[PDB]
Structure 1
Amino acid sequence: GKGKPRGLNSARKLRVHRRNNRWAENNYKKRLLGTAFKSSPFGGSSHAKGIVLEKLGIESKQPNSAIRKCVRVQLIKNGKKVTAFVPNDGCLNFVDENDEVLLAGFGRKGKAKGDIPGVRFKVVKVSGVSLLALWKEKKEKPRS
């Protein structure tokens, strides 16, 4: 016995010490206050319907080179700007300005990957054609 009184009547005091020390993890503290329901631009959501303003680019750190051609997209359901990323090669000519886009996360749960800072979010679908079906091209590109 090291601390934690084992006594059979004592079940309250080592339940409160259990629940107090429950507030130290990196996932329980964020499920307790609803981190995706007050903070966190995705409203508890794997996806959000987006609309792009225009194109930009963000550079990679040390050690590498080759600025990665990001995108600045605001969101419909909350109305605020955010930066994103197109994980692909080419096809940024295919995604236009001021048209519908549909984006998601990385699985990295925020906390941008290792390469480019301050970018959490990646592009799944633009105007309804899902550009992974455009890079490995077998699809309509519609009349704009």
Structure 2
Amino acid sequence: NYKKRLLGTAFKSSPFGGSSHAKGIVLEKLGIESKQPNSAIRKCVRVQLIKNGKKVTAFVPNDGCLNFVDENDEVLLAGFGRKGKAKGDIPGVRFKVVKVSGVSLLALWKEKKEKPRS
């Protein structure tokens, strides 16, 4: 048949499959800086997946600066940057870390605050 060569829409995500989230055993906990318009050291982790086996960097927001996501943490990894564009301040991250989840539930939640959860 006829058509010009159309490419289907591609999410800029190195994990694939048909899965929302993913487990990952982690290497290190980093604290990287950012691009031009904003300062502050923003926290990240080097998540290596089990099923897919890809190296990704993920932003860990939390009300805990040195919150527990260590070297060998079984952390759950979601989207945010898969959904929408990738983040402006600290580029490279396009994955956000989920709280208290997975099989083992090692990575902790937002602490020192007593507004409703999230």
- Give the structure-1-normalised TM-score: 0.57
Structure 1: runs of 5+ lacking an equivalent: 1-26
Larger radius of gyration: 1
Number of residue equivalences: 118
Contact 2:64 2:110 in 1 (8 A): no
Q: Percent identity?
A: 100
* Aligned-pair Cα RMSD in Å: 6.4
Structure 2: runs of 5+ lacking an equivalent: none
Give the Cα–Cα distance (whole angstroms) in 2 for the partners of residues 119 and 88 of structure 1. 16
In structure 2, the CA distance between the partners of 1:32 and 1:139, relative to structure 1 (3 Å rule), is farther
Contact 1:91 1:131 in 2 (8 A): no
In structure 2, the CA distance between the partners of 1:101 and 1:135, relative to structure 1 (3 Å rule), is closer
4+ residue runs of structure 1 moved beyond 3 angstroms?
Answer: 27-40, 125-144
In structure 2, the CA distance between the partners of 1:109 and 1:129, relative to structure 1 (3 Å rule), is same
Give the Cα–Cα distance (whole angstroms) in 1 for the partners of residues 106 and 82 of structure 2. 20
Higher helix share: 1
- Give the structure-2-normalised TM-score: 0.67
Q: Map 1:54-69; keep pairs closer than 5 Å.
A: 54-69=28-43
